[PDB]
């Protein structure tokens, strides 16, 4: 077919690109084994959209399989795992057929697959045989297995594999100010090229070097952050002016060794550089587990059994002799580490399965597409810090024994008492999108909140949208339009009925407007809070609530293949808001309004014009026709009074009667914005104008614009008129009846277009019509919706941006790129979402244990494209002091009881704290200042806190409020301003 | 070190810029409704007797984000004045208010922003002109420029608060 | 003494720095700012399970020759 459903794969296309998904849609994938690991991999690969998925697992479903196999139910026990899972996988993506391989007796059946994945149900002997067939046949092979809090993956993409894009990052680009004969490229003023040695670039608009711009690639020799060298350019000519370099990614051919070869001489990729010595140890340990099974009728070591763990140490020791390159000379066997592997061999842990499920699934997609850098070739992992303290939760053969429940392979690692405390946890999940759905799935497998003293509260104010289905796997096509949190809660209750009646699905947005719902009692009842948010303001709001209530917060985020986790522990670590992230890129106002040079500048200009044309103008009219004092408000508001009045005047002057009037309006706006205004700009700053130094004014970042001559056959000119007319018709309630060029052309060709001519307030206010003349008249403002392809929103913004791009000789962009920039869409894929959620749930175990050693916690940072995994201990909360009294700058606060009077509050801080309160604020309002005149001081010093707020904010404190946060500036006993904690007023 | 919140840092800078001993006489600063910490009404004054904008009292409004000073504030002349770097809506092109030729940084203060504004007022940036006619008259018709600036200075004197004493010339 | 270390970003780019084991983390951030334009306030450097903090030195984190530091960041989607 070659077509990609952009309404479904929207967010994933921004991660992988179209070419990669075209290859994916030609790839048939086979997954061996459908326990938790296999089904997690299959879920993410089917969501991604490969040509077909085939599963093989004829083993009967057992109750213990449900520990992480979220598609199995108790009614499935006794049936084949592959059969009962096939139809559930098929529901994930109608574009991907899911079939069951009945038997693997004939290995030649693998010839019909492009990627074969062998999970933990395949013996090492069979993995080697299968890998040998795949390697010698050119079939990509990936293996993976998890054992308790341990796991590994192996990748063998064959003797020949080509990486087409190593990182999937946006190509670097930049403007050039000089290219010397030796090839020294200098950047335009204070601009960094951001290149490194060995990158390749192409060039455009380099005047004087001609063939340099023909697409030829040049290898980058970096000189400094502002210059690089490409080799001599004398053969091309002599540099004059202009130029733009663009980084190009070149193909890289690589070669993989077979599994058999890699068992004796592994190439490691580390999941945690702090544990890099463990990779070689776990490499022998996982092999020894297979040798143990051979000697014990296919059985794993018994849970917490010392006799078996000692036998595994002996197997590892014998393996190091047979494979001396693994550990190296002088390196002893880490017996404690191997013992824990034996102890946990039967464990099946949701967070670990999620981690490898997302990682291996992404490796599958790399093997289908050549997109991103494949893991090469072995990666081992452990999360042993998740183990609780053995004194509170002892681990032995009795406490970890199975109790005939779906949690038995989790009890095997953590013990019964610990699993019961997980069930009895009270948790808040904020957001029910990609991370939210995966989080609820993990919690369902955990049984978290299923106990008599536990529960789950999940809230989200958003509805399900088609593009969400690509990575929010609890939702189905039939669910589009329903509330995410309610649908998600029902989906996980079907997966684990122990959660039935234990999940409170709310549809409220978390923020300052819903504090009556999420009040003091709500937050104080929680054990901890987990974020699943997609914006910084909500994360900041939740972080401040957790600081206020001293609740642990589990934070996480993703961006394409990149992800991160952060743990916030009351009285221990800093909070989310304690550190800063790089801000979103901003456009200097002069560049936006007058001198664009990138498509990003014309898209922002177009989006702003869209809002002014079809939203702000409508709202100003509705206020002018319904508010009696609107004309007086804007005159003293004030800002751009001339703009608002002309907006209302124009909106009520050329009022369209039919759609043809809207066509004429849009054609005239085209002439104004892309012809007349451009001529007016050139009239003041001609194309050959000079600056102060005699240099051309239109140089470097300034691109000399040219006016547009309307051409209906230009796609951008046409759709500007189509979308502009349709959106104006919507404002004025004009109905309709694919646009016909001839019909539009006839209307436009009969128009008389005024030619260009180059160029107090009390008259405009008198030219406005009386609101009584327009009784009942109303304009319908547009609400920007980027995901409705029929509303003309993206159509207008794309066409409007591309017309301005044509003015300034900027290369135009398609609707998908414009939607990405104008809609601020975050690239997203299910693989990274599952992996990051797994890491969060490995940190969640440390919360249940109430760990106070900061070194046991780990913040996570991942990029599956590299692949890179890195972890760091959280930063401790900083400590401060006032008058020698130490306090925690994050978590400490003053508690005052009762609606105290301002004078008593000030008097208490002088005696109890030695602090002279000089300024006091509530929210954004200043309530008290010591430098007030004696008139305001006497008035405010006698009022209680609540009345003081009412005096300043003119709004009463609602009855639902039980506490108030006050911020103060104060002087210490030496009369110097000092940082102090905030105040909590307990009403 | 000292990680002050936005409201506290704004209150301390507000107190210093209105103290009868440390307040810069070039700026008359008050809070909106004498309470809102994150939007300030500022009267910009040019005390340089050798500047064309001398004698004016240009009202303006400054709005601060919730992550101050890790994000730049917004500045707008109310109403918009005649200047090559000021648009008709009151906003203006100045590098210090842009983030990412000195740009914005958390070390910048309200004082340094206002100082950079009065400097741009005396010395407009013609290489990054907001909009004509002020930019074209600045180069082509200098006498028209001064007549437009002087007419803008006298128009701003009506916005001087009652009982306010204009500081002496420098 | 003098040594050569690397700084790799979450996107994959690699930076090389000639340093001494006695250099402070504050000085390393100042050099990354001049090389990459990233303000030290926005630099999250991690190495061997620890996040590098101001006031310490490279030798305090057992950073040796050919060691690679990682510039990471937090993401806002999901
Ligand atoms: N303040 C908030 N309170 C409650 N839920 C929130 C808040 N802010 C964001 N969310 C929810 O967090 C979720 C983020 O997940 P995600 O971004 O994957 O879904 P989405 O926004 O529907 O998808 P896309 O970003 O691709 O359109 C959204 O469902 C959103 O509604
Ligand atoms: Mg979102």
Locate A645 and state its tokens: 């009045």
Residues 6+ apart with CB under 8 A from A889: A877, A878, A879, A880, A979, A981, B3
Q: Residue A110: beta bridge partners?
A: none
How many angstroms separate the alpha carbon of residue A366 from the centre of ligand 1?
Answer: 28
Q: Give resolution in angstroms.
A: 2.1
Task: For residue B89, give both structure tokens.
Answer: 């809506």
A540 sits in which H/E element: helix A536-549
The C-alpha atoms of residue A575 and residue A543 are separated, in whole angstroms, by: 7
Q: Tell me how close the Cα of B69 comes to any Cα of chain A, in angstroms.
A: 11
Q: How far apart are CA A590 and CA A685, in angstroms?
A: 14
Q: H or E stretch including B2? A: none
Ligand 2 centroid distance, CA of A438 (Å): 15
Full set of structural domains in chain A with CATH: 1-117 (3.50.50.80), 118-169+249-420 (3.40.50.12550), 170-248 (2.40.30.180), 421-579+826-892 (3.40.50.720), 580-825 (1.10.10.2660), 893-987 (3.10.290.60)
- By Cβ distance, the residue of A166, A434, A873 closest to C12 is A166
Q: Is A884 helix (H, G, I), strand (E, B) or coil?
A: coil
Is the preceding peptide bond at B69 cis, omega within 30 degrees of 0? yes
Residues of chain B found within 8 Å of residue C41, distances taken between Cβ atoms: 70, 106
Q: Which residue, A268, A394, A284, is CA-closest to A335?
A: A284
The first and second tokens of residue A397, run together, are: 């053969």
**CA A611 – CA A615 distance, rounded (Å):** 5
Is the bond leading into A867 cis (omega within 30 degrees of zero)?
yes
Tokens encoding A722: 């189509």
Token duo for residue A664: 């004429």
Strand partners of residue A144: A153
**Which of A12, A460, A541, A560 is the pocket-test mutation for ligand 1 (most atoms within 8 Å of CB)?**
A460
Distance in angstroms (rounded) separating the CA atoms of residues A542 and A412: 35
- The three-class DSSP label of residue A701 is coil
Q: Count how many Cα atoms sit within 13 Å of the Cα of residue A477 in the half-sphere of its side chain.
A: 9
Residue nearest to ligand 1 atom 29, measured at CA: A433
- Is C49 near chain A, with CB under 8 Å? yes
Closest CA to A472 of A859, A973, A834, A911: A834
Q: Is the CB of A888 under 6 A from ligand 1?
A: no
DSSP state of A255: -
Report the distance separating Cα A817 and Cα A685, nearest Å: 32
Asked if residue A244 lies in contact with residue A175, where contact means CB atoms within 8 angstroms, the answer is yes
**A222-227: which pairs have CB atoms within 8 A and are 24 or more residues apart?**
A222/A193, A222/A195, A222/A196, A222/A197, A223/A184, A225/A192, A225/A193, A225/C34, A225/C35, A225/C36, A225/C37, A226/A186, A226/A187, A226/A190, A226/A191, A226/A192, A226/A193, A227/A184, A227/A185, A227/A186, A227/A187, A227/A193
Nearest ligand by distance to the CA of A533: 1
Alpha-carbon distances of A929 from A883, A956, A967, B90, rounded to whole Å: 22, 21, 12, 31
The SS3 assignment for A76 reads helix
Which tokens sit at A787? Answer: 């995901």
3-state secondary structure of B25: coil
Q: Helix or strand or coil: residue A59?
A: coil
A159 touches chain B (CB under 8 A): no
Annotated catalytic residue, options A437, A493, A546, A590 = A590
Please state, in angstroms and rounded to a whole number, the distance separating the CA atoms of residues A679 and A837: 55
Using DSSP bridges, classify how beta strands A426-430 and A528-531 pair: parallel, antiparallel or unpaired: parallel
Name the 3-class secondary structure at A53.
strand
Distance separating alpha carbons of residues A741 and A23, to the nearest angstrom: 36
Cα dihedral sign for A917, A919, A920, A923?
Answer: negative
**In the structure encoding, which two tokens stand for residue A220, read together?**
């980058």
Lateral strand order in the sheet of A98-100? A98-100, A52-56, A28-32, A115-118, A140-147, A150-156, A378-382
Specify burial of residue A356 (Cβ count, 10 A radius: 0-12, 13-18, 19+).
buried
Q: Please, what is the Cα angle at A983 between A979 and A986, to 5 degrees?
A: 170
User: Which residue, judged by its Cα, is nearest atom 10 of ligand 1?
Assistant: A431
Q: Phi and psi of A821, rounded to 5°?
A: -75, -50
Are the C-beta atoms of B169 and B49 separated by less than 8 Å? yes
Q: How would you label A33-66 residue by residue, b for 16+ Cβ within 10 Å and e otherwise?
A: bbbbbbbbbbbbbbbbbbbbbbbbbeeebebbbb
User: Which domains occur in chain B, in start order?
Assistant: 1-170 (3.10.110.10)
Sign of the CA dihedral with A40 first, then A46, A51, and A54 last: positive
Backbone angles phi, psi at A324, to 5 degrees: -70, -20
Spell out a b/e string for A328-337, using b for 16 or more CB atoms within 10 Å of the CB, else e.
eeeeebbeeb
Pick the CATH number of C2-72 from 3.10.20.90, 3.30.70.380, 3.30.2350.10, 3.10.129.10: 3.10.20.90
Identify which of A386, A492, A462, A438 has the alpha carbon closest to the alpha carbon of residue A71. Answer: A492
Q: Tell me: cis bond preceding B79? Omega within 30 of 0 counts.
A: yes
Count other C-beta atoms under 10 Å from residue A925's C-beta.
Answer: 21
Distance CA A488, CA A347 (A): 27
At what angle are helices A715-731 and A793-807 packed, to 10 degrees? 130
Which candidate, A103, A222, A80, A249, places its Cα nearest to that of A163? A249
Structure tokens at A694: 């005699």
CA–CA separation, A970 and A666 (whole Å): 59
From the list A433, A468, A560, the residue with the least C-alpha distance to A13 is: A560
Instruction: Provide the 8-state DSSP code for A518.
Output: S
For the beta carbon of residue C66, count every other beta carbon within 10 angstroms: 8
Chain B residues closer than 8 Å to A596 by CB: none
Contact C74, A557 (CB under 8 A): yes
How many CB atoms neighbour CB A939 within 10 A? Answer: 12
SS (H, E, C) A341-393: HHHCCCCECHHHHHHHHHHHHHHHHHHHHCECCCCCCEEEEECHHHCCCCCCC
Give yes or no for a cis peptide into B133 (omega within 30° of 0).
Answer: yes
- Say yes or no: A971 contacts chain B, CB-CB below 8 A: no
Token duo for residue A180: 């010397």
Give bridge partners of residue A56 from the DSSP assignment.
A32
Measured between beta carbons, the chain C residues lying within 8 angstroms of A171 are: none
What is the CA angle A7-A11-A13, rounded to 5?
A: 85
Nearest Cα neighbor of A386 from A871, A875, A890 is A871
* B-chain residue closest to C42, CA distance: B70
Measured in Å, residue A434 CA sits from the centre of ligand 1 at 8
| A309 Cβ neighbours under 8 A, 6+ residues apart | A301, A338, A339, A342, A343
Cβ-based contacts of C39 with chain B (< 8 Å): 105
List the structure tokens of A330: 């002088």
Give the nearest chain B residue to C38 (CA atoms).
B100
How far is the C-alpha of A876 from the C-alpha of C47, rounded, in Å? 17
CA geometry: angle C39, C45, C48, nearest 5 deg: 175
- To the question of whether residue A5 is assigned a binding role by annotation, the answer is no
Q: According to the annotation, is A484 in a ligand binding site? A: yes
- Give the determination technique: X-ray
Cα(A698)–Cα(A659) distance, integer angstroms? 40
Residue in the block written with tokens 């899911």: A98
**CA-based Rg of chain C, rounded to a whole angstrom?**
12
Considering only residues 466 to 505 of chain A, which have any Cβ-Cβ distance to chain C shorter than 8 Å?
A: none
**Other beta carbons within 10 Å of A824:** 11
Q: What stretch of H or E contains A751?
A: none
Contacts of residue C33, defined as CB under 8 A and 6 or more positions apart, other chains included, come to C39, C40, C43
Residue A501 CB contacts under 8 Å (≥ 6 apart), including other chains: none
Tokens of A230: 């490409």
- Please name which ligand lies nearest the alpha carbon of C78: 1
Domain positions in chain C are 2-72
Specify whether the CB–CB gap between A949 and A927 falls below 8 A: yes
Residue with tokens 């008599």: A452
Place of tokens 């063998």: A156
C-alpha of A173 from chain center = 24
User: What is the C-alpha separation between A313 and A288, in angstroms, rounded?
Assistant: 8
Distance CA A342, CA A301 (A): 6
Query: Can A662 be counted among the known catalytic residues?
Result: no
């Amino acid at each position: 077919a070659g077509e990609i459903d952009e309404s479904l794969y929207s967010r994933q296309l921004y991660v992988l690109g179209k070419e990669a998904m075209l290859k994916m849609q030609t790839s048939n994938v086979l997954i061996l084994g459908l326990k938790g690991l296999g089904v997690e991999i299959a879920k993410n690969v089917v969501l991604a959209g490969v040509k077909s998925m085939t599963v093989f697992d004829p083993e009967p479903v057992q109750l213990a399989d449900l520990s992480t196999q979220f598609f199995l139910t108790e009614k499935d026990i006794g049936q084949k795992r592959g059969d009962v899972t096939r139809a559930k996988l098929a529901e994930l993506n109608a574009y991907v057929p899911v079939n069951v391989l009945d038997s693997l007796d004939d290995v030649t059946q693998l010839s019909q697959f492009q990627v074969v994945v062998a999970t933990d149900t395949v013996s090492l002997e069979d993995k080697v045989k299968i890998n040998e067939f795949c390697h010698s046949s050119g079939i990509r092979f990936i293996s993976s297995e998890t054992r308790g809090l341990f796991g590994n993956t192996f990748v063998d993409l064959g003797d020949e594999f080509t990486v087409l894009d190593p990182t999937g990052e946006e190509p670097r680009t930049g403007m050039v100010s000089d290219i010397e004969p030796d090839g020294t490229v200098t950047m335009l003023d204070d601009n960094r090229h951001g290149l490194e040695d060995g990158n390749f670039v192409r060039f455009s608009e380099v005047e004087g070097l001609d063939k340099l711009n023909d697409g030829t690639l040049f290898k980058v020799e970096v000189l400094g952050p502002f210059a690089f060298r490409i080799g001599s350019v004398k053969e091309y000519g002599e540099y004059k002016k202009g130029g733009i370099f663009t980084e190009v990614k070149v193909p890289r051919k690589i070669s993989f060794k077979s599994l058999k070869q890699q068992l004796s001489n592994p190439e490691f990729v580390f999941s945690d550089f702090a544990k890099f010595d463990r990779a070689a140890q776990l490499h022998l340990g996982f092999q020894a587990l297979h040798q143990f099974a051979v000697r014990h009728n296919g059985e794993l070591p018994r849970t917490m059994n010392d006799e078996d763990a000692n036998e595994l140490i002996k197997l590892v020791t014998d393996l190091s002799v047979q494979q001396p390159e693994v550990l190296g000379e002088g390196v002893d066997v880490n017996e404690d580490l191997i013992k824990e592997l034996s102890y946990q061999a039967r464990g099946d842990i949701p967070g670990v399965v999620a981690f490898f499920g997302g990682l291996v699934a992404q490796e599958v997609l790399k093997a289908c597409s050549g997109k991103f850098t494949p893991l090469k070739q072995f990666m081992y992992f452990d999360s042993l810090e998740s183990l609780p303290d053995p004194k509170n939760f002892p681990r032995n053969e009795k406490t970890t024994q199975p109790v005939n429940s779906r949690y038995d392979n989790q009890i095997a690692v953590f013990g019964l008492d610990f699993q019961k405390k997980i069930a009895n946890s009270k948790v808040f999940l904020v957001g029910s999108g990609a991370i939210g759905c995966e989080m609820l799935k993990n919690w369902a497998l955990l049984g978290l909140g299923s106990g008599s003293d536990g529960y789950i509260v999940v809230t989200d104010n958003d509805s399900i949208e088609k593009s969400n289905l690509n990575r929010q796997f609890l939702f189905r096509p039939k669910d589009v339009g329903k509330n995410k949190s309610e649908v998600a809660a029902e989906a996980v209750c079907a997966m684990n009925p122990d959660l039935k009646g234990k999940i409170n699905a709310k549809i409220d947005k978390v923020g300052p407007e819903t504090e009556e719902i999420f009040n003091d009692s709500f937050w104080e009842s929680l054990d901890f809070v987990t974020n699943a948010l997609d914006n910084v303001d909500a994360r900041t709001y939740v972080d401040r609530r957790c600081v206020f209530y001293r609740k642990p917060l589990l934070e996480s985020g993703t961006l394409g293949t990149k992800g991160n986790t952060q743990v916030i522990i009351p009285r221990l670590t800093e909070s989310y808001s304690s550190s800063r992230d790089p801000p979103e890129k901003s456009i200097p106002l002069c560049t936006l309004r007058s001198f664009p040079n990138k498509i990003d500048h014309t898209i922002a200009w177009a989006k702003s014009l869209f809002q002014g044309y079809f939203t702000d103008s409508a709202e100003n009219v509705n206020m002018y026709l319904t508010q009696p004092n609107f004309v007086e408000q804007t005159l003293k508001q004030s800002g751009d009074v001339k703009g608002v009045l002309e907006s209302i005047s124009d909106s009520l002057s050329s009022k369209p009667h039919n759609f043809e009037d809207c066509i004429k309006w849009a054609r005239l706006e085209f002439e104004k914005k892309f012809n007349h205004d451009i001529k007016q700009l050139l009239f003041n700053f001609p194309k050959d104008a000079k600056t102060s130094n005699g240099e051309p004014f239109w140089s470097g970042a300034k691109r000399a614009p040219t006016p547009l001559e309307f051409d209906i056959y230009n796609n951008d000119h046409f759709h500007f008129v189509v979308a502009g007319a349709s959106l104006r018709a919507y404002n004025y309630g004009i109905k309709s009846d694919k646009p016909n060029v001839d019909e539009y052309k006839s209307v436009i060709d009969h128009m008389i277009i005024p030619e260009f001519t180059p160029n107090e307030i009390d008259q405009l206010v008198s030219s406005l019509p009386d609101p009584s003349t327009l009784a009942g008249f109303k304009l319908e403002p547009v609400d920007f919706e980027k995901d409705d392809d029929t509303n003309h929103h993206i159509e207008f913004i794309t066409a409007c941006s591309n017309c301005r791009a044509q003015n300034y000789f900027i290369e135009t962009a398609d609707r998908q790129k414009t939607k990405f920039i104008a809609g601020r869409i975050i690239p997203a894929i299910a693989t990274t979402t599952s992996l990051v959620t797994g890491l969060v749930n490995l940190e969640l175990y440390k919360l249940i244990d109430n760990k106070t050693d900061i070194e046991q916690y780990k913040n996570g940072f991942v990029n599956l494209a590299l692949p890179f995994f890195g972890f760091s201990e959280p930063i401790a909360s900083p400590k401060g002091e006032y008058n020698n009294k130490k306090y925690d700058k994050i978590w400490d606060r003053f508690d005052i009881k009762g609606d105290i009077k301002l004078s008593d509050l000030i008097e208490h801080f002088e005696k109890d704290e030695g602090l002279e309160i000089t300024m006091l604020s509530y929210g954004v309002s200043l309530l008290y200042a010591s430098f007030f005149p004696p008139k305001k001081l006497k008035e405010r010093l006698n009022l209680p806190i609540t009345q003081l707020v009412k005096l300043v904010t003119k709004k009463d404190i609602p009855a639902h409020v039980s506490t108030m946060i006050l911020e103060i500036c104060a002087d210490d006993k030496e009369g110097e301003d000092v940082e102090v904690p905030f105040i909590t007023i307990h009403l | 070190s000292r990680k002050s919140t936005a409201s506290s840092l704004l209150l301390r800078q507000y107190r210093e810029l209105t103290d009868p001993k440390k307040a810069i006489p070039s700026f008359h600063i008050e809070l909106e409704d004498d309470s809102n910490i994150f939007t300030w009404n500022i009267g910009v004054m040019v005390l340089n007797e050798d500047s064309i904008y001398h004698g004016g009292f240009f009202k303006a409004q400054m709005r601060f984000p919730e992550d101050f000073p890790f994000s730049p504030p917004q500045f707008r002349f109310t109403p918009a004045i005649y200047h090559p770097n000021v648009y008709r809506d009151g906003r203006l092109c100045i590098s210090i208010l842009h983030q990412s030729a000195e740009t914005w940084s958390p070390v910048q203060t309200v004082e340094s922003v206002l100082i950079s504004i009065v400097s741009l007022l005396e010395d407009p940036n013609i290489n990054s002109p907001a909009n004509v006619d002020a930019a074209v008259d600045y180069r082509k018709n200098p006498e028209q420029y001064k007549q437009r600036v002087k007419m803008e200075v006298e128009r701003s004197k009506q916005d001087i608060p009652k009982g306010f004493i204009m500081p002496t010339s420098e | 003494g003098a040594m050569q270390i690397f700084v790799r970003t979450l996107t994959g780019r690699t930076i090389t720095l000639e340093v001494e084991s006695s250099d402070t983390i504050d000085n390393v951030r100042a050099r990354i700012q001049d090389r990459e334009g990233i303000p030290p306030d926005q630099q999250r450097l991690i190495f061997a399970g620890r996040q590098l903090e101001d006031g310490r030195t490279l030798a305090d984190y057992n950073i040796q020759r050919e060691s690679t530091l990682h510039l990471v960041l937090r993401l806002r989607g999901g």
